[PDB]
Tab-separated table of C-alpha atoms in Angstrom:
chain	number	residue	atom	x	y	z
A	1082	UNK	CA	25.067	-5.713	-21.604
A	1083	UNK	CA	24.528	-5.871	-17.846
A	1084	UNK	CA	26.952	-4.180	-15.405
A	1085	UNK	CA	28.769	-6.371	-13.322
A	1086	UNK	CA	27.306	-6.138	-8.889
A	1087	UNK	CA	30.767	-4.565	-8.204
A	1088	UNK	CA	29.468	-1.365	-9.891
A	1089	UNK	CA	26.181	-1.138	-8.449
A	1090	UNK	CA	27.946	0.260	-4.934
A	1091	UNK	CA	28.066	3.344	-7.493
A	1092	UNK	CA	24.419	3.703	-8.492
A	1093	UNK	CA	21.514	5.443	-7.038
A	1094	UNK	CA	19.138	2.417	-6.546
A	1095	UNK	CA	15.276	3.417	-5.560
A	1096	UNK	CA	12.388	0.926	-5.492
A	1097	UNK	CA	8.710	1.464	-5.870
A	1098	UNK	CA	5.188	0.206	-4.391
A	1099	UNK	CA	1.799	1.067	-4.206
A	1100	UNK	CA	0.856	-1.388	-0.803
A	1101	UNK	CA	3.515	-1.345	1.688
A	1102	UNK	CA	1.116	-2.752	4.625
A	1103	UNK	CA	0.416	-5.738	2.375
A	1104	UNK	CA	3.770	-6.475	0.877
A	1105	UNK	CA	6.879	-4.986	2.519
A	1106	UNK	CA	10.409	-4.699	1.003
A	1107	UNK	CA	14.383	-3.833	3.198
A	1108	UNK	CA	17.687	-3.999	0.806
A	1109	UNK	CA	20.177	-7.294	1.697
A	1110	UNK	CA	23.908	-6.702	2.524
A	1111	UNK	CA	24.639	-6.412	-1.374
A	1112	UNK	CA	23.323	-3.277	-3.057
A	1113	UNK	CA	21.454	-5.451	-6.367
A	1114	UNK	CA	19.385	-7.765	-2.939
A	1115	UNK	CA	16.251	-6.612	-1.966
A	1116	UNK	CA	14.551	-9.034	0.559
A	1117	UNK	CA	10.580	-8.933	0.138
A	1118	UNK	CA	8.057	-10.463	2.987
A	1119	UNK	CA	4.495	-10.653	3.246
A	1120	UNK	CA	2.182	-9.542	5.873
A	1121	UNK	CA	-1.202	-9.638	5.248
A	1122	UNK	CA	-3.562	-11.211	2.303
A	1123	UNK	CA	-4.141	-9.065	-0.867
A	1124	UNK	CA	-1.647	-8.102	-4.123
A	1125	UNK	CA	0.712	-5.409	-4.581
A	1126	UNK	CA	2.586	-3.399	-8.066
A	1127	UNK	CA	6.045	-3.294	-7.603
A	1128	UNK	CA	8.799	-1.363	-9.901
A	1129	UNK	CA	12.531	0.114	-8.994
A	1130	UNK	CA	14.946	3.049	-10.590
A	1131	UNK	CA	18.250	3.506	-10.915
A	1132	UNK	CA	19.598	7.013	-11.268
A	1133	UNK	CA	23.061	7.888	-11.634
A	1134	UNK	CA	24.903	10.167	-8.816
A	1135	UNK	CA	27.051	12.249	-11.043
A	1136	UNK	CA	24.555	13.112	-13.917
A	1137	UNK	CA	21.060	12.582	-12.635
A	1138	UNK	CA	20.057	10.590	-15.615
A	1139	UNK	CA	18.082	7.459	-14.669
A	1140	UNK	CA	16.151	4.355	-15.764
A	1141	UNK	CA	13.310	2.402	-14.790
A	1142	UNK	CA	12.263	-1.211	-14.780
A	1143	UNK	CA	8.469	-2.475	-16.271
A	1144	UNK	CA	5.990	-2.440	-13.437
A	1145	UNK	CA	5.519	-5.930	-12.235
A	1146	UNK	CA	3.357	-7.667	-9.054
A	1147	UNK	CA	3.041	-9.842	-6.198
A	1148	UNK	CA	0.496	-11.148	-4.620
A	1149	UNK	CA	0.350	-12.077	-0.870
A	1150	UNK	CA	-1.524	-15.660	0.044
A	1153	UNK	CA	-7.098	-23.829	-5.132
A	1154	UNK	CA	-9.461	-26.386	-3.824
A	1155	UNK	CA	-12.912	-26.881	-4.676
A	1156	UNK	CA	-16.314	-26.898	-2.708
A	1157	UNK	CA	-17.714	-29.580	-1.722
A	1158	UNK	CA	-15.298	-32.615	-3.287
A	1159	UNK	CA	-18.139	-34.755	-3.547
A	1160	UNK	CA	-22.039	-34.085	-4.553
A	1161	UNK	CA	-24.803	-35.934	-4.711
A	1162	UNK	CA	-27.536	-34.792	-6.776
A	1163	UNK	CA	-31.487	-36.385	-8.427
A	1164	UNK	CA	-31.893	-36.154	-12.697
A	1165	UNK	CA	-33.010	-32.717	-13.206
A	1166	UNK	CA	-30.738	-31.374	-10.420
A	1167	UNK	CA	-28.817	-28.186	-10.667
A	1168	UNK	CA	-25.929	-26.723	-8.763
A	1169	UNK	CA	-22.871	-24.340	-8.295
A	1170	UNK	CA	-19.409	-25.195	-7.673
A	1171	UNK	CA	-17.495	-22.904	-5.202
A	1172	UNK	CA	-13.782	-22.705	-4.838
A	1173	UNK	CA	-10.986	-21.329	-2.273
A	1174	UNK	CA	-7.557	-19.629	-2.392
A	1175	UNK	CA	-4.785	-19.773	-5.443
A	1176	UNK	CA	-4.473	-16.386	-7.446
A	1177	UNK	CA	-8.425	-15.094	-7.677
A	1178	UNK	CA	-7.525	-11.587	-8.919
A	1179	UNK	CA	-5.263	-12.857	-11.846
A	1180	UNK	CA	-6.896	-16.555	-12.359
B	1328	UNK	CA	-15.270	-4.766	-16.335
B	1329	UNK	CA	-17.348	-6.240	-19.456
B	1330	UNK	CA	-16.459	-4.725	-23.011
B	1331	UNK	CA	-19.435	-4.592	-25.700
B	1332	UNK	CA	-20.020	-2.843	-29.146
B	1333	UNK	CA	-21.370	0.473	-28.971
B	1334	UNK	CA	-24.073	-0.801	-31.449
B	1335	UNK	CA	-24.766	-3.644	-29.556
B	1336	UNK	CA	-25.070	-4.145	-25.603
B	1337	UNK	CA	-26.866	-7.639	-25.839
B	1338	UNK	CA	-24.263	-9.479	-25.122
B	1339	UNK	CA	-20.157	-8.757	-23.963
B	1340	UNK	CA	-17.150	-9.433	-26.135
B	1341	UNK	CA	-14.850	-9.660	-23.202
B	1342	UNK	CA	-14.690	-9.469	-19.342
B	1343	UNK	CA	-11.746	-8.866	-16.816
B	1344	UNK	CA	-10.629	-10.593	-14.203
B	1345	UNK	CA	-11.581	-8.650	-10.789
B	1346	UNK	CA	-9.892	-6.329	-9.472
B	1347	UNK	CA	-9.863	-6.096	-5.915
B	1348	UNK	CA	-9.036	-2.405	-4.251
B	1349	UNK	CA	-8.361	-2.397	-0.300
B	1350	UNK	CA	-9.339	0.986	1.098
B	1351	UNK	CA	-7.749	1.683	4.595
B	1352	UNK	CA	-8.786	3.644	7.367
B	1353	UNK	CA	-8.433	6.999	8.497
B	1354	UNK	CA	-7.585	8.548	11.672
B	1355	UNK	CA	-10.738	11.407	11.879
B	1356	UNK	CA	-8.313	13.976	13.555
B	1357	UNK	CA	-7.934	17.084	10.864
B	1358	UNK	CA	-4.067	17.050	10.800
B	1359	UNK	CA	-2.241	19.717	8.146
B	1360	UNK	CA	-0.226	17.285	5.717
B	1361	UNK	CA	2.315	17.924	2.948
B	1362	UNK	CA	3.146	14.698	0.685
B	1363	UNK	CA	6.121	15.737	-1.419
B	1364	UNK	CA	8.329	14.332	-3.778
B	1365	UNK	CA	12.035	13.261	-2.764
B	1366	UNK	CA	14.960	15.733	-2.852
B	1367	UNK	CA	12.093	18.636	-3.604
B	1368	UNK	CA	11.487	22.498	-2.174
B	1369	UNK	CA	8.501	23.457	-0.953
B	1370	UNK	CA	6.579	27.055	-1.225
B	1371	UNK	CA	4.544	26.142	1.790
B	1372	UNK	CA	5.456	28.837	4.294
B	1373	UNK	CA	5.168	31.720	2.200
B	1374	UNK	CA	1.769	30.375	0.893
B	1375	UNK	CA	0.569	29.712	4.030
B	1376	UNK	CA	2.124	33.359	5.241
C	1426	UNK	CA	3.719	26.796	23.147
C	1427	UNK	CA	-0.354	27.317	23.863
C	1428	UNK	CA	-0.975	29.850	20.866
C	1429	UNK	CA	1.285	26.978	18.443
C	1430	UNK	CA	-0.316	24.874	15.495
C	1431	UNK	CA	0.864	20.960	14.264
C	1432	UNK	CA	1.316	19.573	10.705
C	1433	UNK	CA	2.426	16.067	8.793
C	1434	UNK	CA	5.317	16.112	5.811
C	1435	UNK	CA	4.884	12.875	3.743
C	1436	UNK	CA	8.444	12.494	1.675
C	1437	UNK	CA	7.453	9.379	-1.233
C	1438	UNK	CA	8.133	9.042	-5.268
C	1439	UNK	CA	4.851	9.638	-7.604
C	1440	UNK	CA	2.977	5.862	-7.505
C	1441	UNK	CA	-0.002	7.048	-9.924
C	1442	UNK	CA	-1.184	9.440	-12.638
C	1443	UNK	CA	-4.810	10.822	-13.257
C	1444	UNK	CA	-5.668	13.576	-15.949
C	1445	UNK	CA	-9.304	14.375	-15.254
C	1446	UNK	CA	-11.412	17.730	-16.745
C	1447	UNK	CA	-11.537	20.883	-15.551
C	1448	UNK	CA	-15.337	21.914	-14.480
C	1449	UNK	CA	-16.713	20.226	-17.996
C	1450	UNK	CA	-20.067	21.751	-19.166
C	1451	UNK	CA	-20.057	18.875	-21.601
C	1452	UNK	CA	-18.720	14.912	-22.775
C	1453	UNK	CA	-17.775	16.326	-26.414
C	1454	UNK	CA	-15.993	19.259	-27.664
C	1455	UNK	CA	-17.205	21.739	-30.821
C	1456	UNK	CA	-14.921	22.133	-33.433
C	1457	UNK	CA	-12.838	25.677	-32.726
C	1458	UNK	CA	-14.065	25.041	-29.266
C	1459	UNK	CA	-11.038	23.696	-25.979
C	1460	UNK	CA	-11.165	22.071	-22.552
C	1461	UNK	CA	-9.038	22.270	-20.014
C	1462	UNK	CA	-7.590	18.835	-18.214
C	1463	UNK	CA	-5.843	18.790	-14.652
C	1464	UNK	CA	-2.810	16.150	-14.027
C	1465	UNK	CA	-3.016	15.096	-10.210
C	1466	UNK	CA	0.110	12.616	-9.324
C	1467	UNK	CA	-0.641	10.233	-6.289
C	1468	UNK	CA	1.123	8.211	-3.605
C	1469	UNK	CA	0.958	4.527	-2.762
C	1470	UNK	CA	-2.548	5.289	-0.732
C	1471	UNK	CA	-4.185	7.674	-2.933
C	1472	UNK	CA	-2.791	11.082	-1.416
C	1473	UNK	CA	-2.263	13.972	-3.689
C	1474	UNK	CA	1.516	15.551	-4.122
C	1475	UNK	CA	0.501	19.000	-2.840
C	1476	UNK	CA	4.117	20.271	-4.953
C	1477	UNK	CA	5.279	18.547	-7.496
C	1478	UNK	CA	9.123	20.407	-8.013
C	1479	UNK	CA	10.939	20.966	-10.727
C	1480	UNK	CA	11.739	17.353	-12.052
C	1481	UNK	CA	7.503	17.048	-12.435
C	1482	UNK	CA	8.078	17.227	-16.542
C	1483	UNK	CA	4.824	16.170	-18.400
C	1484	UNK	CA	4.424	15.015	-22.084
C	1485	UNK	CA	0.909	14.636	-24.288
C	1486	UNK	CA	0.625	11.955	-27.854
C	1487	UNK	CA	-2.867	12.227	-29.550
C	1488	UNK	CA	-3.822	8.691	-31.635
C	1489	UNK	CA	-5.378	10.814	-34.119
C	1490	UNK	CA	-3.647	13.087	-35.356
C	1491	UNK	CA	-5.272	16.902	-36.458
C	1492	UNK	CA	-8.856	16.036	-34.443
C	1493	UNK	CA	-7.000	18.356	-32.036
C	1494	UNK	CA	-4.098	20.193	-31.009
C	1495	UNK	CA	-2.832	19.594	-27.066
C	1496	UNK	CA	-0.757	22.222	-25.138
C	1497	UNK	CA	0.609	21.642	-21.435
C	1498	UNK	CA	1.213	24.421	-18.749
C	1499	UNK	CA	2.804	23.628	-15.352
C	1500	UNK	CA	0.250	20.365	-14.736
C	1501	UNK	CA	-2.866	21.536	-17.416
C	1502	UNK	CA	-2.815	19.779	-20.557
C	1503	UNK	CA	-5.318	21.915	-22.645
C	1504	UNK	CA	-6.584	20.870	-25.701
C	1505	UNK	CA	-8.572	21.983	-28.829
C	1506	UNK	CA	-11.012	20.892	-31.806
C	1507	UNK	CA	-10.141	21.020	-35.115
C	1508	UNK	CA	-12.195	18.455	-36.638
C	1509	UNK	CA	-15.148	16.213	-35.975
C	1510	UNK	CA	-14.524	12.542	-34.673
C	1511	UNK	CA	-13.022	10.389	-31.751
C	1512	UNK	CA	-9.333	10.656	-30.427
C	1513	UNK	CA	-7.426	9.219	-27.145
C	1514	UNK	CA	-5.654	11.724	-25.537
C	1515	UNK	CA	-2.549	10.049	-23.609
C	1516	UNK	CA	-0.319	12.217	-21.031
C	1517	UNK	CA	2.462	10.581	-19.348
C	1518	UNK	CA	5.729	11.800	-16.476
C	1519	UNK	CA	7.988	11.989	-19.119
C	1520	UNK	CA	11.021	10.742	-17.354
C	1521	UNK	CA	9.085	8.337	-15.316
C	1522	UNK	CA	6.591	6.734	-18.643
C	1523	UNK	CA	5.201	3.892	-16.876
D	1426	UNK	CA	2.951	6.979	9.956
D	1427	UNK	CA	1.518	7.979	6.625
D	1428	UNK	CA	-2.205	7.307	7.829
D	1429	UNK	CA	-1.355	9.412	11.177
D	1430	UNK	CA	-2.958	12.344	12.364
D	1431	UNK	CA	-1.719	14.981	14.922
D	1432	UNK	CA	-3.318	16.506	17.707
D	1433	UNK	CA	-2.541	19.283	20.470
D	1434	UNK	CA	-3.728	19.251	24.082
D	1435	UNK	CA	-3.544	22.540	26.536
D	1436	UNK	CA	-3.667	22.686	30.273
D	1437	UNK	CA	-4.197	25.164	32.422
D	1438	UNK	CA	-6.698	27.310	34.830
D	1439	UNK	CA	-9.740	28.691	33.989
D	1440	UNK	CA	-9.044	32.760	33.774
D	1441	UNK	CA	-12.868	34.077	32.372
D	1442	UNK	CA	-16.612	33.066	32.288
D	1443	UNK	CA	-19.467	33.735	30.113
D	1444	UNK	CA	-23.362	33.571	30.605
D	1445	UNK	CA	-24.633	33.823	26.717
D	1446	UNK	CA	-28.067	33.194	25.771
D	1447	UNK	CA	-28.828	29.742	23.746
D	1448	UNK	CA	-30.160	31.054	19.788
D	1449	UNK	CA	-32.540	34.367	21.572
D	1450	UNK	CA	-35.427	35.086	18.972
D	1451	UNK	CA	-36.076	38.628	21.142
D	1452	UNK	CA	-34.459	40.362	24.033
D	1453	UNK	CA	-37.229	38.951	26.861
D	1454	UNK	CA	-39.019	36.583	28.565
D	1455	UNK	CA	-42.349	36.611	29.336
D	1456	UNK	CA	-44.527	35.572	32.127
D	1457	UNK	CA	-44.761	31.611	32.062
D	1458	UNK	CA	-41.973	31.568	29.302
D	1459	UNK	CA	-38.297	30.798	29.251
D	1460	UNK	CA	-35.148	31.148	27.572
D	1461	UNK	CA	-31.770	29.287	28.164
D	1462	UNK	CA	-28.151	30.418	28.631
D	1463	UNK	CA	-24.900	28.410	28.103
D	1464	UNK	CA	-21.613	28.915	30.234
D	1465	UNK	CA	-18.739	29.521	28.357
D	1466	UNK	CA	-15.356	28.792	30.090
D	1467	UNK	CA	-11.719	30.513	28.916
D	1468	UNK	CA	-8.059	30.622	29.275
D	1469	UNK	CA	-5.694	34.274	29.184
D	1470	UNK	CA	-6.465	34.122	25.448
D	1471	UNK	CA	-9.496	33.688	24.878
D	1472	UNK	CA	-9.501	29.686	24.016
D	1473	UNK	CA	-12.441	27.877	25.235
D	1474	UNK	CA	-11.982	24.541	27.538
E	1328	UNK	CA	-17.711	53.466	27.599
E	1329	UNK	CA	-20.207	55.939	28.661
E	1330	UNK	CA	-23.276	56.102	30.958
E	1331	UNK	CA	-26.759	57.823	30.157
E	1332	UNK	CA	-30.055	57.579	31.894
E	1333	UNK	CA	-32.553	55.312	29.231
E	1334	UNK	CA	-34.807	58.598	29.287
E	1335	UNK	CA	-32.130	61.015	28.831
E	1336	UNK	CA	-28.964	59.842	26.685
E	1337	UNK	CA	-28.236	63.347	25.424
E	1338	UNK	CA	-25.350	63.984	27.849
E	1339	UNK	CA	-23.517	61.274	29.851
E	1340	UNK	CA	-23.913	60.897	33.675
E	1341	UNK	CA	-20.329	58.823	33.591
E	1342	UNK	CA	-17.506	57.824	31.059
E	1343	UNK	CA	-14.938	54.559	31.800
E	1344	UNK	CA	-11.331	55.219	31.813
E	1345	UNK	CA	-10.861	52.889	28.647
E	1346	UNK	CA	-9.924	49.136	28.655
E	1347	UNK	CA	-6.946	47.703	26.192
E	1348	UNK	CA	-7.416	44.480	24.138
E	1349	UNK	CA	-4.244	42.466	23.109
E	1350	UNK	CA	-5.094	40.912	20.140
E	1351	UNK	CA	-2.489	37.848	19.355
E	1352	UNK	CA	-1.508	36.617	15.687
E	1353	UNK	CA	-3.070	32.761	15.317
E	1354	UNK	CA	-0.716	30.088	13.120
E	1355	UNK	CA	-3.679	29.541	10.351
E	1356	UNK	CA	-2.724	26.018	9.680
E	1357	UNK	CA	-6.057	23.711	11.159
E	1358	UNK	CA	-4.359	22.080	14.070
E	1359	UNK	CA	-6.909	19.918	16.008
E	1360	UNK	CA	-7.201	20.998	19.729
E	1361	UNK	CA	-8.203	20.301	23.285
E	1362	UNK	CA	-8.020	22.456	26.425
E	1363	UNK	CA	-8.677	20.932	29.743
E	1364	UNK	CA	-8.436	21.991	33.067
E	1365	UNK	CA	-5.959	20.494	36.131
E	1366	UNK	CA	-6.458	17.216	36.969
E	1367	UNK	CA	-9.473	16.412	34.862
E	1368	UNK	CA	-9.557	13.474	32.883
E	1369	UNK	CA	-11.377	13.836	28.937
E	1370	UNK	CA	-13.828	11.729	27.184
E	1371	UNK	CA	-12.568	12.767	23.504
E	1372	UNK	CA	-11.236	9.652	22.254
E	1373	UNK	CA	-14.406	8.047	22.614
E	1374	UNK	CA	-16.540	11.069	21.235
E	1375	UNK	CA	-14.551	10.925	18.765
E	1376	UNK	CA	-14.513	7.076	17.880
């Protein structure tokens, strides 16, 4: 069951990155927002805790991502019979694509 | 990363995707630095004497 | 003031985990025969806790079981032989497992 | 701030000099030879500038 | 400190009335440092990229 955002003014909330200059995180005016922005281009693990303030006991969420941001090269070729050739490509998700 | 048998080499099973690593620069100024964890003592100034 | 020295204090949670061998003379260990691992914990960036505290709890599963035995002291997971064959070793923060 | 480095900087008179000789292989010189010597500046504690 | 002739150093011609050295405790954490003189301006940051 999931508690209700009126009782997460009681918990202990801590997030977790590995590449703050890429990816940078502030918490909203309610306690369960976190707003996110991007800076510059690359990708970023993100996770958060919760511990509790009266027994120290906490949990933690799976590890997840973001990354920070297709076409092809050229969009036309002309080539002879016997011809040979590589396609090149720009932008989209090229370290989980 | 390319996974093959141990028997044979030939030719990979499987390959990743890429990961990418971004190393960032240092400032070359030798500077005495603690990284501890949050809400954590540290021995420090009676290592140090 | 002129005699006086400078130094950083970094305050961040534990972002990685690496358990890597202590001074190996070898890749494979003889039955009856140990080795010695270090656990090194690591911010967003690479840098390496220099204290860990108290909270710093570390726990050890082996996939195959009776290859070896595994101990852990402070942040040293040592580990012995006890028969021939391959085994992952997998150490973990115990109240942190990811 | 966590890639930072720290650094100190000191002002003040000179207070002592020092005439040292630059990596001496004997104690002498000899006719149509030569030997060099470095100057060595300090503060009231020994510190060099 | 004591003066003798370089031919004769079994008895001293003159002694010193002796000097005292104040020896001052250093903070041994490696604190990068400059000293510079008044009014002098230093080329570090570029020696040092």
């Amino acid at each position: 069951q999931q508690f209700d955002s009126t009782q997460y003014q009681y918990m202990n909330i801590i997030p977790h990155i590995d590449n703050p200059n890429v990816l940078s995180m502030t918490q909203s005016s309610d306690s369960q927002v976190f707003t996110l922005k991007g800076l510059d281009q690359g990708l970023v693990t993100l996770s958060v805790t919760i511990q509790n303030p009266k027994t120290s006991f906490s949990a933690t969420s799976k590890t997840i991502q973001i990354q920070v941001f297709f076409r092809v090269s050229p969009s036309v070729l002309h080539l002879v019979p016997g011809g040979h050739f590589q396609i090149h490509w720009t932008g989209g998700a090229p370290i989980r694509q | 990363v390319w996974a093959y048998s141990g028997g044979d080499k030939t030719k990979h099973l499987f390959q990743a995707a890429s990961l990418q690593i971004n190393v960032i620069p240092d400032i070359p100024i030798q500077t005495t630095s603690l990284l501890l964890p949050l809400n954590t003592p540290s021995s420090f100034i009676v290592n140090n004497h | 003031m002129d005699t006086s020295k400078l130094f950083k204090i970094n305050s961040k949670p534990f972002s990685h985990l690496e358990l890597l061998p202590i001074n190996p003379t070898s890749t494979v260990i003889p039955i009856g025969g140990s080795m010695s691992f270090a656990i090194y914990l690591r911010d967003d960036i690479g840098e390496v806790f220099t204290e860990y505290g108290s909270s710093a709890i570390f726990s050890s599963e082996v996939s195959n079981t009776g290859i070896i035995s595994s101990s852990i002291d402070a942040n040293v997971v040592t580990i012995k032989g006890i028969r021939a064959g391959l085994v992952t070793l997998h150490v973990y923060l115990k109240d942190m497992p990811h």
